[PDB]
Task: inverse folding
């Protein structure tokens, strides 16, 4: 029955609880779309959540605050309406504010699984074998591999080849994610990388230790071995 | 020695200088793209595939500023990887079952976002009311959004309207992008009808009040015309 928390004065990543009545709380979080208030209702010996705190950060803090102050498990949650509170790496860069660049293929692929995010189009990379200059690097589309849209980045000044998830480290002996991968085209796409960058001295995989051009041959062998 | 990602503490990002103006950035994720590139562009920096997640990306930017001291002006994504997570995704990963009306989940589909797992039936018509656990769900009709629900806690006579209800201090309509300004006052009337016994009303933002918040909200929306 005291001072209700003003959302703007709650630090980033923190959430306040306000008990309205027995087994009824309101949770308040910073509101950087302005919904700062939500509800916590006791459900027997469990808790029902109404409109969780905005964002992944605040929701995690909400659950932690609930456990600390109430000590009852949150088993169910209701969204009263739709609000896109998703934040990723590109969103943090956008607010930095760094301009993010992506191929049309990548952007169109983002649409099917969630975007609306402003990005700039990287033209001239729609066909396998295409290569364009972007600032201090060269962008290369080898074709489908780990994903239908994966690009390769080469740094000519240092002869450094970054293959992303399309390239494995030496210690990786079996194919990983593969869900969005074209296992058939993957070795062919690697061949295009090998032919277009024979001068590469430093090859960086998506995960793990860097190596030489042997990473390309290694990745192709692992993917091929993922057959029948 | 090049950092093995599994031996990097949680929430930390490493920078490995390969050559002049060329760094790799390594983040931990054994639970998963761990490597990325930083290439010097004149007196600026070009970022290749920022670290996975909002937290690591922020730590990456901080580490870049601390160690290199040059501004990141552009960033390239080599491929789409969904590290964009919201509240529903955290709830789902923590073992919390998420619920929403078919209308809300249908709206969720049209944006490719994270759909609440289970459907809340019996709320497709204006005036509909169902019980869900310790609360009553009420669909007043279109207001702040086509799908907005009202939550009533009968044991405490507490009314929660979400963004469909303003606090007293709000004298102008805010986020009204998906709002039906014409139906909003009518939908509010239905709320007033179904819950005249409500003692505490919680707005989507700001201080709680009584049933006067309903009247107040309708006045603000009408004044927007
Ligand atoms: Zn809201
Ligand atoms: Zn990938």
Result:
């Amino acid at each position: 029955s005291r001072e209700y928390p003003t959302a703007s004065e709650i630090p980033d990543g923190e959430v306040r609880l306000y008990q309205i009545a027995d087994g009824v709380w309101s949770h308040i979080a910073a509101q950087p779309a302005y919904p700062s208030n939500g509800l916590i209702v006791r459900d027997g010996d469990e808790l029902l959540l109404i409109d969780t705190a905005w964002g992944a950060k605040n929701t995690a803090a909400l659950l932690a605050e609930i456990e600390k102050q109430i000590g009852l498990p949150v088993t169910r949650a209701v969204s009263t309406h739709f609000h896109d509170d998703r934040v990723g790496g590109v969103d943090v860069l956008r607010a930095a504010g760094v301009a993010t660049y992506a191929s049309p293929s990548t952007r169109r692929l983002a649409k099917v699984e969630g975007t609306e995010i402003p990005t700039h189009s990287l033209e001239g990379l729609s066909s396998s074998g295409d290569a364009v200059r972007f600032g201090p690097v060269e962008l290369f589309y080898p074709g489908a591999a780990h994903s239908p849209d994966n690009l390769i980045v080469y740094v000519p000044s240092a002869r450094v080849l970054y293959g992303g998830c399309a390239i494995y480290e030496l210690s990786r002996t079996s194919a990983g994610n593969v869900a969005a991968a074209d296992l058939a085209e993957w070795p062919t796409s690697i061949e295009r990388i090998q032919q277009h960058y024979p001068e590469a001295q430093f090859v960086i995989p998506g995960h793990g230790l860097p190596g030489g051009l042997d990473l390309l041959k290694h990745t192709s062998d692992v993917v091929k071995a993922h057959t029948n």
